[PDB]
């Protein structure tokens, strides 16, 4: 019996790729279909060897090898929209690699994916990664705070947000993380109340908090 | 301050908390007397403090 008939009735939510080491990879697209395909091979109704791959799992499998044999590297994400030719999204303004070294990196990345045929390495600008992150953060009218430093930026969304602004700040972060990853730019949404709760204070370079009408507190300059 | 300080009764009902440091007190006392709201006077022997 073939493997594509031993899965469910719908022959479109899986894709069987023949490997290069006498194996047979099954490409699921989420965790629910990954547990669906792993129940078949774990209960043992297949006399050959086969694996179940996933985009989120393989993206950390070849990011564990890459921070040991290629440290100090700037990359974003590997895209598996066509699982026989993955696309490696590298950074342009943060690497010092020549073309001969990129050919060796494209050859060593091919051996970790036996189902693949030819990994394609493309470079992208480091500015549009934060430009799309700030432009999408300004359409939803979310109050934020950008912190620029070397090798990454950070957007901080604090305050007492209402319910439609936690939903719009979650539907945007999940859609950005699906396409760019979390290597370079990182959102820090933090729901907390008002600091200095109901206390009156006098801010700026010589600060005090009035704990009471007859009580002064002198912490750090508020 | 090299002189004793005498604090009145109505100006001793206020409270203060924090870490302070008296490197020069005659300049620190002018700043705290404007933030807390106080008047003071040095008559050669003591430093009186009122609100």
């Amino acid at each position: 019996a073939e493997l594509d008939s031993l899965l469910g009735q719908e022959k479109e939510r899986f894709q069987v790729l023949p490997g290069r080491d006498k194996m047979l990879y099954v490409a699921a697209q989420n965790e629910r279909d990954t547990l669906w395909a792993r129940q078949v091979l774990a209960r043992g109704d297949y006399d050959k060897n086969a694996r179940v791959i996933n985009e989120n799992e393989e993206n950390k499998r070849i990011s564990i090898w890459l921070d040991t044999y290629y440290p100090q590297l700037a990359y974003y994400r590997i895209h598996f929209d066509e699982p026989r030719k993955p696309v490696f999204w590298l950074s342009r303004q943060r690497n010092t690699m020549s073309k001969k070294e990129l050919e060796v990196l494209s050859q060593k990345l091919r051996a970790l994916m036996p189902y693949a045929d030819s990994v394609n390495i493309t470079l992208m600008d480091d500015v549009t990664a934060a430009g799309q992150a700030e432009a999408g953060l300004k359409q939803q009218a979310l109050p934020y705070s950008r912190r620029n430093h070397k090798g990454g930026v950070t957007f901080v969304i604090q305050g007492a947000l209402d319910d439609v602004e936690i939903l719009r700040a979650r539907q945007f972060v999940d859609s950005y993380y699906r396409t760019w990853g979390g290597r370079y730019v990182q959102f820090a949404i933090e729901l907390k109340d008002d600091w200095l709760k109901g206390r009156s204070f006098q801010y700026g370079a010589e600060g005090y908090i009035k704990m009471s009408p007859g009580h002064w507190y002198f912490p750090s300059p508020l | 301050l090299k002189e004793p300080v005498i604090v009145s009764k109505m100006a001793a009902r206020k409270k203060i908390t924090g870490n302070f440091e008296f490197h020069d007190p005659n300049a620190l006392l002018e700043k705290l007397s404007l933030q807390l709201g106080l008047i003071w006077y040095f008559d050669g022997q003591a430093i009186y403090i009122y609100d």
């Binding site: 009156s200 801010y203 | 404007l34 709201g37």
Partner: peptide
Amino acid sequence: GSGFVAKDDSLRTFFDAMALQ
């Protein structure tokens, strides 16, 4: 910059804070 954030202050503790500026 300086400034004062009053939350239901009683107009004596408000004008005491302006006694430095």
